[PDB]
Amino acid sequence: QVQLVESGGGSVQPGRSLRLSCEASGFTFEAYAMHWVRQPPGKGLEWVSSINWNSGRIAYADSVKGRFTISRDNARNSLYLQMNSLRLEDTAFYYCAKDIRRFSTGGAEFEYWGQGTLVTVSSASTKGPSVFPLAPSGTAALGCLVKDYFPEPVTVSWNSGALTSGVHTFPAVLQSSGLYSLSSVVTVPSSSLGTQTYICNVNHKPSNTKVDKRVEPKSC
């Protein structure tokens, strides 16, 4: 199975530099042109750069020409994007993509994409979240409140992935303070409350934060 994993995202100040990487497995990396595509949150797709199998032919979109450098290490099955002189409008998910064709020299055909690394160009300071229980009131609703973090993104799972049904993890909203906040809620049967343990797992990779929060009913 083809697999592409991007890393190197997180927050970065305007004017500064950031290097993204992509690890490729499940195919003969050194035979396929690789590309970077980016997507500003909520907006559309923009092609960034291309490099063929031996790095002989390289292409850049005009919006990054002169600031970004694409490269690759076939022995390490890795693709790199060096980003200099970053601007707010460079804030985006950056996607690593593999070409359909072997040994091509031009064009682009994005056959498989990595899930992307989110780059936030901002003057704000990185800050990890605080996590509070949304304790439950035969449907009963419980959740976790992930408040006052920056930048995006947060991931939330329930019982380390052993609970998937009824789970709604809402899009983050930017508070007036400049920090983000979201809720993840799951509807379970009330029969389950005294019987089952519900833990929300919050990951905030930009601040290197991992928190597990037991969410129990209230005493009353």
């Binding site: 595509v37 031009g106 899930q115 609703a141 959740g143 709604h168 809402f170």
Partner: protein
């Protein structure tokens, strides 16, 4: 600079045939292959159609593409709830020495039957109160359509300016939305009042529904 234009949105009942335009110029679609990409909410784009009409393995045959001149079109036969996504066409553009152009994208939603939300209300945790701010959360679960009004009342006094909303994307299997609204008060203001109520107006409710709690009970 060069743009492939698509309709901003598209919709259909389950089983309906949806069709998405992609309008280009003689420099891109008129000369080069067209590709279509599908992006489910919160995921990365997928290759859906390549070289005008080819489908990868793992793409159902209800997706098909065609190219006629400077325009291209994607067709989804028998729209399913799992098809709710953004769809982007794309093609190489020969002008200006060469560049790849993505289309402006089309959001595809499923038209289902009106469904009223379920409302749940959450008091702030005691742990958050120890830090001096209170967050009250109102949850509107599994409703359709998307538009909804949340109105906070504190001892029946309507609030304004101290709340924020967030809405999910359309659900992959039942085509509903959910909504969270958060009321943020200082700890001191939170303890000065007793009844916290969130009042919900929606097309599925003939009269507004109110869920509330008394602080400290």
């Amino acid at each position: 600079q060069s743009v492939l234009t698509q309709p901003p949105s598209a919709s259909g009942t389950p089983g309906q045939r949806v069709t998405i335009s992609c309008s280009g110029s003689s420099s891109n679609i008129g000369s080069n292959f067209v590709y279509w990409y599908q992006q489910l909410p919160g995921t990365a784009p997928k290759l859906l159609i390549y070289r005008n009409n080819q489908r990868p393995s793992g793409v159902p045959d209800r997706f098909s593409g065609s190219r006629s001149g400077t325009s291209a079109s994607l067709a989804i036969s028998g729209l399913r709830s799992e098809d709710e996504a953004d769809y982007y066409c794309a093609a190489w553009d020969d002008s200006l020495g060469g560049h790849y152009v993505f289309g402006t994208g089309t959001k595809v939603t499923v038209l289902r039957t009106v469904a009223a939300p379920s409302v749940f209300i959450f008091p702030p945790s005691d742990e958050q109160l120890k830090s001096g701010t209170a967050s009250v959360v109102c949850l509107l679960n599994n409703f359709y359509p998307r538009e909804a009004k949340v109105q906070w009342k504190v001892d029946n006094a309507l609030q304004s300016g101290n709340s924020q909303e967030s809405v999910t994307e359309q659900d992959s299997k039942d085509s509903t939305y959910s909504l969270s609204s958060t009321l943020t008060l200082s700890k001191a203001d939170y303890e000065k009042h007793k009844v916290y109520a969130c009042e919900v107006t929606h097309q599925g409710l003939s009269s507004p529904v109110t869920k509330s709690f008394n602080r400290g009970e």
